Design a protein around this ligand. Structure first.
Ligand SMILES: NS(=O)(=O)c1ccc(F)cc1
Ligand SMILES: [Hg+2]
Ligand SMILES: [Zn+2]
Length: 258
């Protein structure tokens, strides 16, 4: 009836309705650290999230998204491998049923427990819908999450999950500061890719951070208690909402550090 991550509508079937799945610049991919080219001409990232306005949080049956007011240049990403300004529209996570899987990108075949995606769109295109029709319309900042110590800034997110347990539920989520989810260093790898969920459009410049953030076992436990199903339908726990690594093909992954 629609795509998902189950046996019958999972990643291995998406190509049937989304032919782009077998394309040339699909994500995610495995980051081979020994083959990434150090590119000294890449500039440092400029993450300016101080006037950021979160509006709400919702469960959409695939994951949960925290949405921001993107009608103005209030929270932006610039510099790095980018030309122009990209406005923050929302962020979400991909996670697993077990601590040893959950991330979409891998490092030297290594899978982390989850992965954060901060989605931005190229302001030169006017709105989000126009950006997805261009090769450089989107910029997604990806951060790996590892099980260890509790992350203070993640707790607000964790406290509200209970109010959006099933598909379609939302709740107001104001005054959330996204800066509390970043690691100390902004060293990164970059490559041309795509959305990791249908429609799988190849409009993305991926920026994967080297240093992961650590979150407590209890914090990740609460993610696994959400539901794929809407209210009143049989329960299907929301876990393993990740796409396996795709072939690199004719692409090169660059690194901003030696
Ligand atoms: N997971 S992701 O590639 O960052 C993604 C971003 C925006 C979407 F609308 C759908 C998927
Ligand atoms: Hg595109
Ligand atoms: Zn994502």
């Amino acid at each position: 009836h629609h795509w998902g991550y189950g046996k019958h509508n999972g990643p291995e079937h998406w190509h049937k309705d989304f032919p782009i799945a077998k394309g040339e610049r699909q994500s995610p991919v495995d980051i081979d650290t020994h083959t990434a080219k150090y590119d000294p001409s890449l500039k440092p990232l400029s993450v300016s999230y101080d006037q950021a306005t979160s509006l709400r949080i919702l469960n959409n049956g695939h994951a949960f998204n925290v949405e921001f007011d993107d009608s103005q240049d209030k929270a932006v990403l610039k510099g790095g491998p980018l030309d122009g300004t990209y406005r923050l529209i929302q962020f979400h996570f991909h996670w697993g049923s077990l601590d040893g899987q959950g991330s979409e990108h891998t490092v030297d075949k290594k899978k982390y427990a989850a992965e954060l995606h901060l989605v931005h769109w190229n302001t030169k295109y006017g709105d989000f819908g126009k950006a997805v029709q261009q090769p450089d319309g989107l910029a997604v900042l990806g951060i790996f999450l590892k099980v260890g110590s509790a992350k203070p800034g993640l707790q607000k997110v964790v406290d509200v999950l209970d109010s959006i347990k099933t598909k379609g539920k939302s709740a107001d989520f104001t005054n959330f500061d996204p800066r509390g989810l970043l690691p100390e260093s902004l060293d990164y790898w970059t490559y041309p890719g795509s959305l990791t969920t249908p429609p799988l459009l190849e409009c993305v410049t991926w920026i994967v951070l080297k240093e992961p953030i650590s979150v407590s076992s209890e914090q990740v436990l609460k993610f696994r208690k959400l539901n794929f199903n809407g209210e009143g339908e049989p329960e299907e726990l929301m876990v393993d909402n990740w796409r396996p690594a795709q072939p690199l093909k004719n692409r090169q992954i660059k690194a901003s550090f030696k």
